[PDB]
């Protein structure tokens, strides 16, 4: 047990096993100067948790940490293979590499889930 955020130096294949310890320590895990701003910080933390939970729920990955989608991986985003991404890079190095192409993926996932829900509703009628 390394602790909170202690797997940041390890590779992303080994840091993918400890998502619960990072996910658990979010969401909390005038008469005085220290009164208003701590309430504002708590409300900001609640909002920042709820926006990420909504963004997970739009893609259809609600209630789970590792979610498999059906969007193919474009070669323009990266050209590295699976043998060295998960065994030579960390999450911090990987985040700086696909930072310019995250909105395209964030739109493709929600359009794929909307198409999947439409196809499910069309299939359940027959």
């Amino acid at each position: 047990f390394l602790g909170f955020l202690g797997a940041a130096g390890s590779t992303m294949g080994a840091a993918s096993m400890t998502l619960t310890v990072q996910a658990r320590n979010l969401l909390s895990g005038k008469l005085t100067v220290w009164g208003i701003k701590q309430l504002q910080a708590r409300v900001l933390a609640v909002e920042r948790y709820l926006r990420d939970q909504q963004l997970l729920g739009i893609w259809g990955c609600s209630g789970k940490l590792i979610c498999c989608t059906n969007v193919p991986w474009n070669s323009s985003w990266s050209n590295r293979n699976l043998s060295e991404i998960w065994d030579n890079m960390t999450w911090l190095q990987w985040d700086k590499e696909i930072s310019n192409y995250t909105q395209i993926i964030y739109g493709l996932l929600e359009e794929s889930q909307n198409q999947q829900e439409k196809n499910e509703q069309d299939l359940l009628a027959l």
């Binding site: 955020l5 130096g9 990072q22 100067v33 220290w34 590792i66 699976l82 999450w91």
Partner: protein
């Protein structure tokens, strides 16, 4: 290969937030969150992080917090509005030791009574730095700031003694500590450790000598934003503390004068015994070895054959050119011109005279002040000199000598020597990755 969404990845970015405080007075400790003793600090193994002591938001937030908790503790205290009168002052010549001569003035004045239709004639002993003559055996004087504002008397039941506080972080944010022993403030760090909250930073107010506080680990550390620019201060951190001993030999007396219904003004009575000036003592040999180590560290940056010189301050006002601190509730002003007087070619004591003010204008705010009430009895003081603030006189691109004078002014550099190892980051738990797996 397909897109896979991971929640809870260890990815952070640099950001800013409103850090709340915790603790184990004017620093409002009773309303802070209690601190739980726990193994709060763990080590991050294979990480390097870029720190910057000069572009930190935590020190600029701590300055605002210290100001906001200073000016709210003076609200349940009496305002000295009716003290703005004409004082008839006389020189005191009782047991004067020829050094504190002309410093104390025995001033008598009319004062209000708790009954509205009555007046009283009282007297008090003021300092020379608090009175200003108005007619340019007795002369007419006035308080130094009654033209500009009205001072608020500091309540005797609150103390200005600093106690340690801890700065925690809210959810979604983390505090990273630099554990490098040879860190110079700016640059990458290979030994970064996350922590739940900072250590106990004592808000000690000083201008030239960083009294109390934390020390370095290995050697004397020299830190600056730009070591070639002479317009930026130099922070020197010691590895061994230098003990300094304050004193105030005058046995003062405090008497209350009722200036209204339930409002009292604490004036200075007579002095039992002789009147001698206050001073500070420091060891000569320890200061000599400490300045030798400081010279040996400064020769690493400024050439290995230069002549390092130390000369006294060149400021304009008393808060810059004179070492100011607070001990026992009384605010001192130490001449410290015998400390910085040396040149360095490649059980005695130093006694430094002091002066005492009572009309205090702290944080350099316009139209706000504070009156410090007198303290009964003698005042003693033991403190640790654990650092310096220096300013370099540069008048040549290449030179064989350098002159360093004591600095001061801004109180932000006092707390920048404690939060240099800390930074705050925001955790982003979402991420996407390519993996050979697909949804049904």
């Amino acid at each position: 290969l397909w897109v896979t969404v991971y929640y809870g990845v260890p990815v952070w970015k640099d950001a800013e937030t409103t850090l709340f405080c915790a603790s184990d007075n004017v620093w409002a400790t009773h309303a802070c969150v209690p601190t739980d003793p726990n193994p709060q600090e763990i080590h991050l193994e294979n990480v390097t992080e870029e720190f910057n002591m000069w572009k930190n938001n935590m020190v600029e937030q701590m300055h605002t917090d210290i100001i906001s908790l200073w000016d709210q503790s003076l609200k349940p205290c009496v305002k000295l509005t009716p003290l703005c009168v004409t004082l008839q002052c006389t020189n005191v010549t009782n047991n004067i030791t020829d050094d504190m001569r002309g410093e104390l003035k025995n001033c008598s004045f009319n004062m209000t009574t708790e009954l509205r239709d009555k007046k009283q004639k009282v007297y008090s002993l003021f300092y020379r730095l608090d009175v200003v003559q108005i007619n340019e055996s007795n002369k007419e004087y006035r308080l130094i700031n009654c033209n500009t504002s009205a001072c608020t008397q500091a309540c005797p039941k609150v103390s200005f003694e600093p106690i340690p506080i801890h700065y925690c972080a809210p959810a979604g944010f983390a505090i990273l500590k630099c554990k490098d022993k040879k860190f110079n403030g700016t640059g990458p760090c290979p030994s970064v450790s996350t922590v739940q909250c900072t250590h106990g930073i004592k808000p000690v107010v000083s201008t030239q000598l960083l009294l109390n506080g934390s020390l370095a680990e290995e050697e004397v550390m020299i830190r600056s934003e730009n070591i070639t620019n002479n317009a930026k201060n130099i922070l020197v951190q010691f590895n061994t503390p230098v003990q300094i001993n304050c004193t105030r030999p005058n046995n003062n007396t405090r008497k209350s004068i009722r200036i209204g219904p339930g409002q009292a003004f604490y004036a200075t009575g007579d002095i039992i015994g002789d009147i001698r000036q206050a001073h500070c003592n420091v060891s000569k040999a320890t200061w000599n070895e400490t300045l030798g180590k400081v010279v040996k560290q400064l020769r690493k940056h400024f050439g290995n054959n230069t002549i390092i010189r130390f000369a006294n301050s060149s400021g304009g006002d008393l808060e810059v050119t004179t070492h100011s601190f607070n001990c026992g509730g009384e605010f001192f002003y130490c001449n410290t011109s015998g400390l910085f007087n040396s040149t360095w070619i490649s059980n005695d004591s130093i006694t430094l005279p002091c002066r005492i003010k009572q009309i205090i204008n702290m944080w350099q705010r316009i139209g706000q002040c504070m009156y410090a009430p007198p303290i009964q009895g003698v005042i003693r003081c033991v403190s640790n000199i654990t650092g310096l603030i220096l300013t370099r006189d540069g008048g040549s691109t290449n030179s064989t000598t350098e002159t360093f004078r004591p600095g001061g002014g801004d109180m932000r550099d006092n707390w920048r020597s404690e939060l240099y190892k800390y930074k705050v980051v925001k955790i982003e738990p979402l991420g996407v990755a390519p993996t050979r797996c697909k949804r049904r």
